[PDB]
């Protein structure tokens, strides 16, 4: 396993800023830490690196200790809102970062092409955009053969093509065997590429699992909309006694809500009879799950429309 | 001690005029009669080393052309070469060569004595404390000492309480004091040159006298030292390169770093048209000696121009014409000879160094360079010093350098 | 009016600058300290040329500390592009910034020369209170004008650059040039030519430096010596009267403010 | 009719950076401009505010002149990235914009309850986060009953709870009758709240309309994420040979790119043979629609997961 | 060694600083223009050059390295660099080598043209005394600059923002060049009954600019203690900077 956090408890003074977190990241998975901007996410991201030390437990990066020099040669990182040395060049910043991590200089000009920075290389860092610097900060994270990545807000300021092309680079890496970690604050946009999310509140760790495992645990409805449905009335009432609200839409269509523990028993009941006619399933998204788990154990909702 | 008549003098002319032929003589000699004796150049009147060699007691004696050698050295009994009594009025001592360890010309109580054109080489081995005076003058009125050459005596031309007399054109080399003055009221001295001397001109307590055209070349620690001189006139003196050293005796002065002019308690005197060149101190003005007419000099090349340890203001320009200063960074818009801005030679930080010598370690600091510049920007912190409105732009002493 | 509504911001933003209040209290404790040393020595014409030299070093400094980031400090801060979408013009958010920063310099020198007057009327016994009020009234309404000149310079050098690190380099360059380089270039032109470059043009070269026009206004009555003036002793060769010297100081504002508006209009 | 851009061909340097768009806007619709980091979006965002001049074209904001003071009272704006005045307070910088736009000073407190900032009001702006400045930057835009918002990426650096609730405030102002223009770059996520999108690049307006109108205009496949499948190779040997690109996401979880006429008949294979634990059907999102229009006119996709 | 790999960065980043290149050009013109007024107008001109290099070589050192640590924390690259195979010692000592060779070159453009203006405009300068008095001058001016380099790492590591780092770097520059010697003069001219002036040659050792001028004026102490007291001010303040940098 890549990261094996076995019950750590980080504390600054008297208060415990991270209370009994216990994670386990497999070597091919893509994990996403989601929490508010307090001490929930960013202290746990530092404990994986060598920046802090667990005051009650221990971590295990790649089956070692988190500050060994053999570890950090095969570990990228990308912090949120970095600005590099503005009088240097694009290429000379990477050639400086190549000698520190021990990666060869031949890998530098590949990586400037790999993030699409070859046209704006050999120019000053001060005449770069916000999204242009994020390509450079990504390019140093792929130095060497990184067996672990920690991308903290990797897609802000980027093009929507370049956002989409970034996750194609991500999905290449998680098939090549390098587990990575996302740390984002925009949940649609990462919710297609998260293999298993690790949403946590202010203090503790709330829920970790796959997206199927979160929706099966958090009882939350689904919108199983189905057009072209024949005969419309006994098909309508057979969900009402089943415990659903069948909306008799006019254009031979029936909207079926559920609780998604009865998910699979309705899909074959919509597919096995022979008249589904181009249905649409609308699962509850990640921010709806984020709305649930924060309201489950860590606040109240805002007033009717406030924030 | 024989007499001058005990020699063999050949008379050239029968008007009490004698002529001693070439040939050596011996012992002391005494003039008791008004005999105008001359000498051939081979007349080496060499004494044995005791007594005053040529004592003169008669008036109107024209001693000429003698060559004296090795008289005594008892300075208490005044072993001179030529002793001149008060009754020996109007003596002429012309063109003589002297070599001996005592007084060269000791006169006292005389009137109109003339010591002209002589060469008095004093000594070589004595420590400049027992060599005796070159031309000693003790309370004489009317004297005329002109164009002599005294070398390696003790304290040069000593003058004590002599009222009216001229010192014209005489060369003084490698002695302790060049010219010493003691209570010589209404004196005068013109065009004298002092070289390599532990004090160029001692001017002690003598009033109303004229110091004009004199030169001081490479003297030690005191160029012209004036103590308690009143109503004097210092016009045209050239004092050059007063280097540091020590006088060796420290009797009336102390050792100095090199001062071209040291004014001590001199109240009224005109100090004009002088030239103070390349010494460590151009002029030292003590606190008791203030308010005297100092205008027209040339303070060139000195490492520190004026030393004035006071807080009283001192204008150094009479009738709107001042002195030429080498470091005067000024301009002249209205095309006169005068500069346009006044020149303060001293800062406030230039007087902290005189008051406290430990500031010399801090003298290269940038804060000191701040402290020199803050006075130039804020004149409230400028202590009232030794400034002169309208300084000169060109050298006024263009003739004294030849 | 909108010019006062944006002036009320800068009046409440410049007074929270802690770097201003350090060097505006430094202007107060030095203007008392110069006027206290002028009381123990008595003279009178040296404390005018030293107070005018103190405000030569500090009233350009407080003006350039305020307004070097007035335009470019709002442009890279993002709040300038927002402000143009408010019902304003580019001429109102500049004249409003000039009124807002101008009342700070009118108050930073009323603290400084105000406490200098109380360190004279309570220190020098038997002083003429009419002559004190008249001389320090001329110091108050002319050190603002020297401050408003360098305020209008700072709007010129902020609209031209597009990065705040380069605005601080130019504001330090303008403060070095007008205060203690132009006084030394004019000194070195007079020394090395020995006053024979131009006997009539060189007094008119004082009008191309607003710190020298500022010193020539306050040293009108109390001339005294020439060595306290130094390079400012060329003012006796100027045939211009004193009233035009006020207007030549006001023309340094209006030229360098209309230039500040013409640069900002094509931002 | 809020914004009626009618034939604006903006050219400066004779470069034609905005070539002949004809963009309307409804009285309550929420338009989304989704340009690149080039000449498309940010040129047209300046033309609505009136601070840029329309070279050969008319811009009639609110049926009036684009730079009248009467329309700038009835308009709000939020810029790209702002840090307002780091020495001022929280209330006073909002009180400063109150007298500028001419709003009443009673509104400046109720916005600080609306924007969740009353806990952090009367504090220095140099102590605020990036999120709190974006919270403040919304509060000036809602000042003085605004009838046309213009927000540029309003949710960056913000909490996911606050991101979700900000769109409720946007949905509050749509029902109040105020047109809103979002100009974002994080396009998966903003598609739940816009009513029409305006996708433009290379200067020209490429396409416009609602999200139903673009999918009708552009035949786009349906992503069928199937998690908890029987075996990986049991299906990826079959769906690939069926001519459907299908990748992997985890140990036993596949996604399937359909051709929309074979979505349902191949969903018969997924349920009737080897039933998984969860099936999610994705509609063609705003992100994948954005990829189509750039490939319609302009740039070709990158190769082997670069960029 | 990775202490050199981060030193090659700071050479390339320091030489493109426009603020440094403005002052280092201004340092070289004032070093010829003082030498112009000392030859056309040699221990008398090496003391006025010592007052010049006491103004600007602390100012050059504080312009380079006031934002060395806290400028990287605000830029975010400091948090990235600690995740590299790098100790906190090699980042600080590697910046000290990298910033150190800049002002070891800035005196070679500073005094390299000043020694050119003396050896070629006196014509009989007796250059055998020059190559040892300027060899002692260029060495001792670098070590003065390395003190204020190590002073800049102490104040950068303590603060949390780049704006308050320049507020302390200006404050350290005012205190150590022209406030410490003015309170030494104020302890002399205003206090004499409670200020022993024999103690004052030992209080000159608490100021690295003061130790800089004393090895250009050759005094109760020898020269070799002053070289070991200038090097101890580098070695203590770098050890102080390393102790602060481990507490971020
Ligand atoms: Mg003149």
From Swiss-Prot, chains A, D:
Q: Its topology with respect to the membrane?
A: Peripheral membrane protein
Q: How does activity depend on pH?
A: Optimum pH is 8.0-8.5.
Q: Can you cite an annotated GO cellular component?
A: plasma membrane
Domain ABC transporter, which positions? 3-227
Q: State if Chloroplast is listed as a keyword.
A: no
State what inhibits or activates this protein.
Answer: Inhibited by AMP-PNP. Partially inhibited by N-ethylmaleimide, orthovanadate and NaN(3).
Q: Which InterPro entries match?
A: AAA+_ATPase, ABC_transporter-like_ATP-bd, ABC_transporter-like_CS, ABC_Transporter_VariousFunc, P-loop_NTPase
Supply one GO molecular-function term. Answer: ATP binding
Transport keyword on record? yes
- Induction text: Induced in response to denitrifying conditions. Activation requires NosR and DnrD regulators.
Q: Which keywords, in A-to-Z order, does the entry hold?
A: ATP-binding, Cell inner membrane, Cell membrane, Hydrolase, Membrane, Nucleotide-binding, Transport
Role of this protein: Required for the assembly of the copper chromophores of nitrous oxide reductase. Has ATPase activity. Could be part of the ABC transporter complex NosDFY.
Looking up PANTHER family in the UniProt record yields: ABC TRANSPORTER ATP-BINDING PROTEIN ALBC-RELATED
Protein name per the record: Probable ABC transporter ATP-binding protein NosF
Organism encoding this protein: Stutzerimonas stutzeri (Pseudomonas stutzeri)
UniProtKB/Swiss-Prot annotation, chain B:
Outline the PbH1 repeats, range by range: 58-86, 88-109, 110-139, 140-161, 162-183, 206-228, 266-287, 289-327
Give the protein's function: Required for the assembly of the copper chromophores of nitrous oxide reductase. Could be part of the ABC transporter complex NosDFY.
Self-association or partners: how does it assemble?
A: The complex may be composed of an ATP-binding protein (NosF), a transmembrane protein (NosY) and a solute-binding protein (NosD).
> Where on the tree of life does the source sit, at the highest rank?
Bacteria
The similarity comment for this entry is: Belongs to the NosD family.
Outline the inducing conditions: Induced in response to denitrifying conditions. Activation requires NosR and DnrD regulators.
| Principal subcellular localization | periplasm
Q: Which organism is it from?
A: Stutzerimonas stutzeri
Q: Which InterPro entries match?
A: Carb-bd_sugar_hydrolysis-dom, NosD_copper_fam, NosD_dom, Para_beta_helix_rpt-2, PbH1, Pectin_lyas_fold, Pectin_lyase_fold/virulence
Tell me the Pfam families matching this sequence. Answer: NosD (PF05048)
Q: What is this protein called?
A: Probable ABC transporter binding protein NosD
Q: Which GO terms describe its cellular component?
A: periplasmic space
Intracellular or extracellular location(s):
Periplasm
SUPFAM superfamilies per UniProt: Pectin lyase-like (SSF51126)
Q: Which key words are in the record? A: Periplasm, Repeat, Signal
Curated annotation (Swiss-Prot), chain C:
Q: Does the keyword Transmembrane apply?
A: yes
Check the record and name the InterPro entries matching this protein.
Answer: ABC2_NosY/YtrC-like
Triggers of expression: Induced in response to denitrifying conditions. Activation requires NosR and DnrD regulators.
> Transmembrane segments in this chain: where?
19-39, 48-68, 104-124, 139-159, 172-192, 244-264
Stored Pfam families: ABC2_membrane_2
Keywords in alphabetical order, please. Cell inner membrane, Cell membrane, Membrane, Transmembrane, Transmembrane helix, Transport
UniProt keyword Cell inner membrane present: yes
Please provide, alphabetically and separated by semicolons, the GO molecular function terms listed in this UniProt record. ABC-type transporter activity
**Its GO CC terms?**
plasma membrane
* Highest taxon of source: Bacteria
Instruction: List the disulfide bonds in this chain.
Output: none
Q: What kind of membrane protein is this, topologically?
A: Multi-pass membrane protein
Provide the primary localization: membrane
Q: Where in the cell is it found?
A: Cell inner membrane
The UniProt subunit note reads as follows:
The complex may be composed of an ATP-binding protein (NosF), a transmembrane protein (NosY) and a solute-binding protein (NosD).
Record PANTHER family: ABC TRANSPORTER PERMEASE, ABC TRANSPORTER PERMEASE PROTEIN NOSY-RELATED
Protein task: Required for the assembly of the copper chromophores of nitrous oxide reductase. Could be part of the ABC transporter complex NosDFY.
The name under which this protein is listed is Probable ABC transporter permease protein NosY
Q: Please name the source species.
A: Stutzerimonas stutzeri (Pseudomonas stutzeri)
Tell me the gene name: nosY
From Swiss-Prot, chain E:
From what superkingdom does this record's organism come?
A: Bacteria
Q: Where are the transmembrane segments?
A: 19-39, 46-66, 102-122, 137-157, 170-190, 225-245
Which terms in the GO cellular component ontology are assigned? plasma membrane
Q: Which UniProt keywords apply?
A: Cell inner membrane, Cell membrane, Membrane, Transmembrane, Transmembrane helix, Transport
**In which compartments does the protein localize?**
Cell inner membrane
Q: How does it sit in the membrane?
A: Multi-pass membrane protein
Inducing factors: Induced in response to denitrifying conditions. Activation requires NosR and DnrD regulators.
A GO molecular function term, named singly, is: ABC-type transporter activity
Tell me the subunit arrangement: The complex may be composed of an ATP-binding protein (NosF), a transmembrane protein (NosY) and a solute-binding protein (NosD).
Task: Give the function comment from the record.
Answer: Required for the assembly of the copper chromophores of nitrous oxide reductase. Could be part of the ABC transporter complex NosDFY.
Query: What PANTHER family does UniProt report for this protein, alphabetically?
Result: ABC TRANSPORTER PERMEASE, ABC TRANSPORTER PERMEASE PROTEIN NOSY-RELATED
In Swiss-Prot or TrEMBL terms, this protein is called Probable ABC transporter permease protein NosY
Organism, as annotated: Stutzerimonas stutzeri
Source lineage: Bacteria, Pseudomonadati, Pseudomonadota, Gammaproteobacteria, Pseudomonadales
